[PDB]
Amino acid sequence: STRNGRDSQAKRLGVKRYEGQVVRAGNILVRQRGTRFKPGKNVGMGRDFTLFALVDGVVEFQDRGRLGRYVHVRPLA
Amino acid sequence: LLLECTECKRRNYATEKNKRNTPNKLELRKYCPWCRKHTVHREVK
Amino acid sequence: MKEGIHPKLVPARIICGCGNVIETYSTKPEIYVEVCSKCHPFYTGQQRFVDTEGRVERFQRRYGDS
């Protein structure tokens, strides 16, 4: 017999809205494990590091080098 | 050790968690009741 | 320095086999000292007292004539 045999549930992680999608206040934007997308303008980040639109708007991505990747919501939806 | 916090009178309040023998003491800390507002809140039972 | 619980450090007087060390500046003023060197006892301005160099030498000398 085998002492192996487990695995855990898929956590269905990753990005839930991409650039230039129209979001709404509260929409969550990224589901993620560490801080690998840091919150930008109008983007909150919850205790599971999870990012959500603060305002209705549209989503843009920004790659700031050693500063990291950033998700902003650009208002006036 | 499951934990249950009384306060003074009217006895409704809220409950808690203590997994330790510290504090072994009367275990009392400040909190908000549903009727009056923010009283002493000791621990019973 | 923090105020309270700290030693005074007051100008003092130190003595020795020599005269006084005027400088001092330490807690517990007027202290006595066993031997201070830099007034040149003890190997500074070395006297080299009760020196020997006689280990080979002694049996080289009295044994010379005898």
Binding site: - | - | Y25, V35, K38, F42
Partner: protein, 181 residues
């Protein structure tokens, strides 16, 4: 207490002989004494803090500063020592009080060391500071020998602004440090 003979002796004897020897272009470039840090590893006292506090009482008496306490960085089992226990005492001193302490150290302390053919001159650490250990604590004038429960030594660290070793030597030489040549 801004007089301090050794301090003066640095400015009106040592600084000049220094420029004459190494030929320094700038006023600042010539070696200064910053920071004599004294330290006792006391781990001889682990579970007894009573032994520690008597020893910090001792330093303050010779230094004129109440020392810090150093605490175990990591737990290392082979000799006792769990993490965070008091290890020993450490006091930083500068600026006057380093002077007044070094003065006493040269005229009184070191003369009172058994043997003492002079200070080993390899302890310059090569970036030009010097370090020395002491066996007992009663070689200082402030200690009365009837106050000692047990003899515990220390580590003295002296930091120079001298970029090099040979320079740092000169400074301390000319200050009157009895090197073993």
């Amino acid at each position: 207490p801004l007089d301090v003979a050794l301090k003066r002796k640095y400015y009106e004897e040592v600084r000049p002989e220094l420029i004459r020897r190494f030929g320094y272009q700038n006023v600042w470039e010539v070696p200064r004494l910053e920071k004599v840090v004294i330290n006792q590893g006391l781990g001889e006292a682990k579970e007894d803090a009573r032994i520690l506090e008597k020893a910090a009482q001792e330093l303050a008496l010779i230094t004129g500063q109440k020392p810090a306490v150093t605490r175990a960085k990591k737990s290392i089992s082979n000799f006792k020592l769990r993490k965070g226990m008091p290890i020993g005492l450490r006091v930083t001193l500068r600026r006057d009080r380093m002077w007044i302490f070094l003065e006493k150290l040269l005229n009184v302390a070191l003369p009172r060391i058994r043997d003492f053919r002079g200070l080993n001159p390899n302890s310059f650490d090569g970036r030009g500071n010097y370090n020395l250990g002491l066996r007992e604590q009663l070689i200082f004038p402030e200690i009365t020998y009837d106050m000692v429960d047990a003899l515990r030594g220390m580590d003295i660290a002296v930091v120079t602004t001298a970029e090099t070793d040979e320079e740092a030597r000169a400074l301390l030489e000319l200050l009157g440090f009895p090197f073993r040549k």
